[PDB]
Each structure stands twice: as C-alpha cells, then as structure tokens.
Symmetry: D3
Subunit: 213 residues, 6 copies
C-alpha cells in the first residue's frame, strides 16, 4: 500500500469562502484523490490555512512557515511513497514577499527537506515528490483580500511555468492545478467545492504514474 | 460526522520494536478506533516518535515538544469534536525530566492549548478532550533504553492516577491505556501489534460516550 | 481598583526627538491618563521603541514583535480591566512591510491574543480593549527617517479608518490619536512632550466609559 | 527621580497561596518599596509567575525564561538607575534543574545582560544591580507542590550564601529575602500578604544606599 | 599576534558564478589578506552563503541571519583585535527587503553586537571594526538571478555612501569594496577569483592601520 | 588540499585555567594538528566555550547547543573532507543532564546532521567523521566547578567506550582523547597547554588514515 502526504495551505484544508467554514470531507482534494486510488493508497491531508512555502507569518495561532513545520510532518507520517506539495498562494502576499520567484525558491527548499530528511526508521529510498502549482489568484472586490494579496493576480500566473521548470531541474513530478480549477472572487484565493474536487480528480493520473499505480 | 484527533508519540505512530519499523496501518490504535466507529467518525492520527508533553528534545529531525507543535496540528485539522491525548512516556526520560508530575503538568498545558485555540473558522464550542495514560514502561535489558529511561518504570506507573485526577479537575475524559495493553521488554516502552490494537479497541466505549456516538 | 495596560512603541515609551532621550515621566501619555483617573485606576506603561504589531525586527536589543511578546506582558500584569493598544507606526517601515492593511491585521492578532489568553489565576471576565490609531506620520527633512519610513505618510493616514472598522468588527473601543496630537517634523514619526500629553488627556473620556469610571 | 525595575516571579507578581488569586496592589513588595521611597523614585514591577533565572519552561502562556525576556523588559523601561532581581524559586523545580548552583549561574547571566544592554538612548553609566535571594522553601502537605518542588527545601537554603558571594564577585548589592520573610506551608513556596510586604520594607535601606536616596 | 575575523556571505565564502563551486583557498579574500599580513596576524574566515545583515532567510540549511549568529561566532573566536564585515548583497533581494537603508541599519546592529559582546574571558578593550561595502550588483541575463535580486543594481550602488557615513558615526573603519572589485555579469552578484583576490589586497592597508600593523 | 573541521568546546577553544584566558594559538589542538599535516590540509577550529552536544544552555552570550549551531558551521566551511568532534564535557553538568548516555545520543545527532547536510555546492562525497572522547573529568578543590560538574568524574569515564561503540555503529572513526591527555585539577575539566598539544599530536595518525594523508 502506497502512502501519499498532501502538504498544503487553505486550498488543501478546504476553505469554503461561501460559508466561511470548511468543505465537507468528501469534497477536499486529498479525499477525492484517495477515493480514486482506493485501497492501493493511504492519503494523508496536511493543509494549513495561511501556510507559506518558507516564510514566517505570526498573524494566526499556528506556525505558517511551511519549511519549519515540514520536518515534523514528514516524521509523523513516514514512511512516505509520495509527497504532493500545493503551496505558493500565500507567498503572493506582499507582507510575505509577493514574488513568484520567492515561492519557487521556497518549494525548492521543501523538496530538499524531503530529500535530506532523517526518517524515524531505516529507509532505503527517497519518496517521490509532485509539485502542484495552485490555481492562480483572481480579481476581487473584497477590499481586505485585495490589499492582502495586492499584485498577486499577476505574480500567481507565473507559478505554473516556474514550478514546471523547477520540477524538471529537481526530478520531481509537476501538475498545474490551474488547468482544472479556478479560484473564487469572493476573496480571490479560495476554491469552491467543485473546483476543489477537480484538483483531486485531475491529479489522479500523474499520482498513479508516480506510484506505479 | 465527528472528527477525532489522536495526538501522541511513537505508541500512536505505531513503532514495531520487533522489526524496527512501523506497524501496519490496520494495527495502529487510531485505525482500530476508526474501524470500530465506522462512518460516524473521521479519525486523524498524529503520532510523533519521541514527542514529549511540553519539553524540548533536539535529538531527531523534528520538533518533539508536544505543546509547541499542538497549535499548528489543531489548526490543520479543525474543526474537531474530540482530542485524544496519549503522551507521557518520553517525559520519563531523565534527560527530559523523568517525573510523572512534570508529565501531568504538560498534559494540563496541552488541555489549555485546546481550550484557548483560535480556530481557523468560527467555532461555537470547545472540542471534548480524552486524556489517555500510556501503558507503563517495563524493565528491559536493552542497555541504551534502560539508560534513556532510567527510573521510568517506577515513575510511569504513577501516570494513570495522576492523569485520572487531572481529567477530573479539568472536565476531561480519562482512560488507562495500561488497563488493556502492556509494553514490550525489547525496549521497555513500545507496543507490539496486538497490544497497539488493544488500546484502540479499549478506547471505543469512552470515545463513543464522549461523542454521543 | 481598575488596572489598565498600555501596550505600545516609542510613542508610549516617550521618545524626545529634540534631545534623543525620553520625555519626563509626567509627560508620557500613560502617566497623564493615570493622573486623570487618580486612585480609581492603576496604569501600567509598556512602550517599547520600534515595536511592530506582529512582525519581527532584529535591529535592536529586544524583541520588537508585538504579538510574540504580548502573552508574557499580559501574564505579568494580569488581571487586567483594559488593554490599550497604540501601535502601527513601525509597521509603516518598508523593511517591516509598510502597509496600513498589514498593521490592522497585526492589531487583529493582538486583540485575539488578549481574548484567548490563559490568565494566571481564574478570571472569568475578559478585559475590555481599546484600539488607538497613532498620530500619523508627517514629512521630514531627516533623510535617515525619510528612508526608514519611506511611503509612511500616505499609509499611516489610513490607520484611523481601518482601526475604527476593526474595533467595530471585534467589539473593541476606538480612539484616533491623530484627532488630538500630531507628529513632529524633526523626524516625522515621534511626538513632542505636549503632543504626548494630548494623547493621554484625549483618551480619558473613552477610558472612563470603558472602565465604568 | 530614580527609576527601579523589580524583576521577579510569582513572589513579585504577588501570588496568594489560598485564594489562588493576586495579592492587592498595596500588599505587593514593589508597592511597599514605592510607598517607602515616595516621590524620590518610580518603581516598576515585572513579576511573572513561574519565571526562572535562565531556563525554558513551556507550561504556561508566556515565556518563563528570565534571561530571554529580560533585554525586552530593560529596553521598555530604560533608563534605569537600579535593577532588583528576586529569582530562584522556580529553579528549584526538578523539571527546571533543581540546583542552587544552576540558579546562581542564572543570576550571573541576568547581571551580565544588564551590564551589556544596548540602551534605547545614549547612556553613560550602568544601572546599579541588587540581587535578592528569595525566601527559602518550606515543607508542605500539599502533595502537588511537594512534587513540583521536590528537593527544593534543602537546595533553596543554599541560595543566600551563593547569591551573596556572587554579588561580591560582581560588584552588585545583596539582600537575603529569607532574613525578613518566610514562605507559607500552604504550598511551600509562596508568600502571604504580610511576608510579601515585609520584603519591600526590608529592601528599603539597601535600595536607598544604592540610589543615594 | 593580532586576530582578525572576517564575517561575510558568499563573496567571503568564495562563490564561483560558473563552476557553481568554491574558489580555491588561496583565491578567497581573507586568504589574500592573511598572506599579505603574514605572521603578524591570524585571519579567520566566516563566510556563509546567503547571509544577510540582520534578516531571517529559511531557504538553506543554515541560519542566514547575520545578527542571530554573530554572538556565537564572536565567542568562538575571541579574543579579537578586528572584525571585518562584508555584508549587504543579500539584503538586496526583495524577499529580504531590497533596500540599501535596511542593510546599513543591519550593519549598525552587527557593530553594536561586537561592542556589547560578553567575551569568554576578561577583556579590557573592544576590537576595532571595519565596515566593507560589497561590490555593487550589475545587470545580468541570468533570469533566476535577475529575479532574485530585482532592483538590486540601483540599491546596491547606495551601500558605499551609507556604510561610509555609518562608519563615521560609529567610529569604525570603512572600505568600499566596489572601489577595487566588480561583480560578474554571469549572475550579477558574485566575484570571480581575480576580483575576490583584489578585495583582500585592497583591504591590507586599512587593516594594517587599524591594527598598528 | 583536504579541509578538516574541528567542532568542540572550551577544550578546543583552548581554555587556560591558570590564567583564565586562552592558550596561545600554537598550543591549541587544531593548530598542532595543522602543523603536523602541513600544506596537505587546511584545519578550521570551531571551539565554543560551554558547547553541549545537543542541549540548550542560555548562560552565556552565544548558542551553546551544538546541534542547533552545527548546520550553519558546516555550511560556512563546506566542502569538508573530515569533521572531528570533541564534545561531551559540558553534557556532564547536571543542569544539562549529566549523563554519558545523553552525550553519546547528542553525538549521534551531530553525526546525522553531517550525513544529511544540504551542502552549498554539489558534492557528492560525504565527509569522513572522527568522534573524539574528551579527556575525562578529574576531582577538584574548586568548589564552583565541583558543583557545576557534580557527578561528572564518574560519568565522563564512560564516554570513551560509549563513543567507540557509536563510531563502530555509525561508521565513523574514533579516538580516545583521554589516552594521550588529562584534565587539570585546578578545575577538573580543562586541559593545560601541554595536555592540549598532546591531543593534537595524538590525533595525527587517525587523521591521516581517514584523509588518506
């Protein structure tokens, strides 16, 4: 049985912007993926609202630095056959840094953290790694969000090509989330239930391919 | 559907001391518990080898301080109907502090962290909390472990009464893991597959009662 | 006897831009408030030079992140009847982030830290919270300050309406410091002695309302 | 006008072993000292429950490491003429270390933090420093306190001679708190209102001498 | 025998923009300086790739905050007669802050860390300090570097005048690295072996004067 | 040219207990090693007073936790052919934990940090590692040191066999420092000049074997 860790942010937690709540379990993209793989895989969802690739954010009751937390998560869930990353939307906040390029460097650090992890028990081989570019940000009239993410429509559109290029450099899998799903203008960043499911459905082929099914 | 977070250490990760590996999924105590509750619950396993209640340990590629990490875990998995804690065995290490009493103060801090958590979305009510005393340590001839855990047979036997008393003070549920399961002398701390399953089976009644089924 | 905590930056410390020293005790705004309230209240001044709302700044011999520090301050001075915040001027520094919106998010975090604090002795009545928008930045010939706070005159002008909107959203009091006081052009950011006294006199009515005298 | 910082733990916060509450303001030791000195001095009380000399403790909603926190506190209250420390009780907990010697080394570190602090504004001359040994622990039937402070009766009796020797070595003032006050057997470590008040008065003469009145 | 600490970033580590490797030992600037000074001095090279003046950067397997790390480095190498800093290039990254002004404030903080360091053994007299502005960035067709350092050409040209003014303010030595060396257009920021060697030689005269030979 | 990193504590710094200062350069063990190897090797000395294997100590102006610091040191000095560890004396302090077993676990962690380090430039050949057991503690009349290291004579005697067993388990080299050198009874823990030189001379053969000269 293959074990798949899904390491993400609110898009992976399953933020429902319509209701200001959480999508149902069955609508979260790791759950869609699990259903599709069935008993051949065990998928673990680790989605944290506001998680950045590598940067500190002290505005919530959690540690939002993806890189600082990842070793603890890897160790909790080892041994792992596949890590699926979907991060970068929070990196588009100017407070964090706002740059597509800083997001791709953060993913690079996360890839290295997986590759160099000191596993809890003796482990022959590195997990495989799938880098997913999140669905790009959209324009919103929500004044708080448009400030929070000022300039991020334009920068977030550059994540797919950069993340694809990194995945090629680092021998990782790549999927463009924005190829199957769009964000909502309620806030410019979140996915409704249908678009969240779509990410899960869309990943099934590359996930199967990376796992040898 | 009720959501149950199981926050523990190697006993919850499912450490196989016979094989120096991880118990199969179906033998881990959260998985036994999930099977028993079926579709009425969604159980989330967060077991980290070497996790202490509240103390730092820099000897592995993770953060083993249960209290520092817990907010991030709570936030990842909210909203939660029940938190089940099973920690304290690592607190028996003299390097950490070695005292049953320090372990119960650490559980107290963890209870407070749940109760005061700033949830990712609007939340009316605190989760319920179930404090589980881990199966007590046994004597071992393994010289590394007997040093690591020097004096912990005697101190670990005091966790059940202290944890029961705390649970009464704080309006938490209580279960003695050591009432259904024993540790293995391979290393004096771990649970074999059968004893791990037993913890899961044994918790089903109090978990159902706390969840209203 | 009501206890009031005043949590702020060099404006609350009492920075004298003319002498590069500290205003006399009696000219600091918390002192002016205390004299106005008399023996009905005990006012505690916690102003730290360079303190930001919720952002790291490693340029001085102290932790300038207001959010990281605040729990320890709350705990030291508990039980509290009112917390008065006056922060955001340092958030106007580009190196911090330079945005009004980032400042009001930081105040939001501070409010939540108060509301969720695990008080040292049983409580049960939450403190009241007063959000004070600092007097906004002005233009200065001081080239070092003009650089340090580049863009800040325009952003700081936005703090009063954003803070007022937040106070309303979160059930806090609001006062616009800039309604009674102005910054000195010697450096664009500080208050002279009279302007520091004006803040303290200006807060007396809203402070009484919130304390029931 | 001389400014005095009082940097301590629950004995300085003013902990009531009975009510489980806070001593009234006028019954706290820095308040007694303030009343004695009158307008010749401004006394600032910074007493945090559980504060250690220089050791982490993650069991409460605050940073209990005296050393970490002290630069922030110094910077907040500068310029200072005198720092009065009264710490060491918490160091008697086996979870912290439980040794008089570790406490005096902690005090040393706090002394050096004062001496090397990079003050907010230009400052010629260091503050004076007064080291206070806390009143020693006594035996208690309170079994949680007896556990928490196990061994502390015998170790805490060593604080006064070690602290006095250090003060001599480092050119600091010294006062033995236990000379004028005793702990309550209600819990073995705290001070009742009368004995708290006595510390403040007892310190008056040495504070006066160090300050030239 | 004088001891000189060289505290820098990849320009001091000796980064080869081509080979993506390390300059040979004799081609690094502190080695050149050492060879020039001969047995009158012992030069210690502490160059860390990506090191900033006083800003966190979690993108590599190390702490890149110059300020955090420097007390440890000072303590390791004390007693020191001279500290030579060459930092600021990394501060030109928009992810760090991207401002010449933020870099000079960072340098200031490093100067004060040297001046206030609590040396391992008794030490009368501070080390001398030499601030080196790094050679300024140049334009590059390398699109990853151009992104990473966007804006840095124009800002890095301001480092020399700001650093010189600071050195005057703080009674430090100053040298403009860009006076004797140029960055490579291969990536816009690094130094080839010849230009690296030139910094070391260029520093010789001012190092000699500060040390009295 | 081989590069050798020497990572240790005040024994590697070169602490002179008679003068409370630092041994001359030429008497420090890494210097003696360097002279013995000549131009075939470049030896880097990183000895920090009070450094522990993997444990926090906040009593000085530095980070004494060997494991927290080591990645930054590896990264600064990479690429390395050999890392030589000489640590554990500070681990014999009760405040740290006082156990030989805790010291060898800390060395274990350090070894793993080396083996998993994300080197700054492509590598691919792992450095060799030499574990050196420090000369064991002796009895002393110095009452402050006798307290600081209470129990340490008996525990430190156990470091050589435990370290040798570890070296064998992990494929590292081993040398017993105590085979060529002894501690001074002036304070029980330090080495005088000749005894520090003896360590350096003593390591030459195993250092050559591991470097292939």
């Amino acid at each position: 049985m293959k074990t798949v860790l899904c390491y993400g942010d609110s898009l992976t937690w399953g933020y429902d912007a319509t209701g200001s709540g959480r999508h149902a379990l069955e609508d979260r993209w790791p759950s869609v993926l699990q259903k599709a793989l069935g008993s051949d895989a065990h998928v673990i969802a680790e989605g944290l609202n506001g998680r950045t690739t590598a940067y500190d954010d002290h505005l919530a009751d959690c540690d939002r630095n993806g890189a600082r937390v990842l070793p603890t998560v890897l160790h909790t869930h080892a041994p792992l056959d596949l890590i699926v990353f979907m991060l970068g939307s929070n990196d588009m906040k100017p407070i964090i840094h706002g740059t597509a390029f800083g997001a791709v460097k953060g993913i690079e650090r996360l890839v290295n953290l997986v590759r160099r992890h000191d596993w809890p028990t003796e482990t022959e081989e590195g997990p495989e790694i799938l880098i997913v570019s999140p669905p790009p940000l959209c324009e919103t009239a929500n004044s708080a969000f448009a400030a929070m993410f000022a300039g991020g429509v334009e920068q977030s559109a550059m994540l797919a090509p950069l993340y694809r290029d990194l995945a090629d450099e680092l021998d990782c899998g790549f999927f463009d989330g924005g190829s199957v799903a769009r964000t909502t203008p309620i806030d410019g960043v979140h996915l409704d239930a249908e678009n969240t499911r779509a990410v899960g459905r869309g990943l099934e082929p590359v996930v199967r391919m990376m796992l040898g099914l």
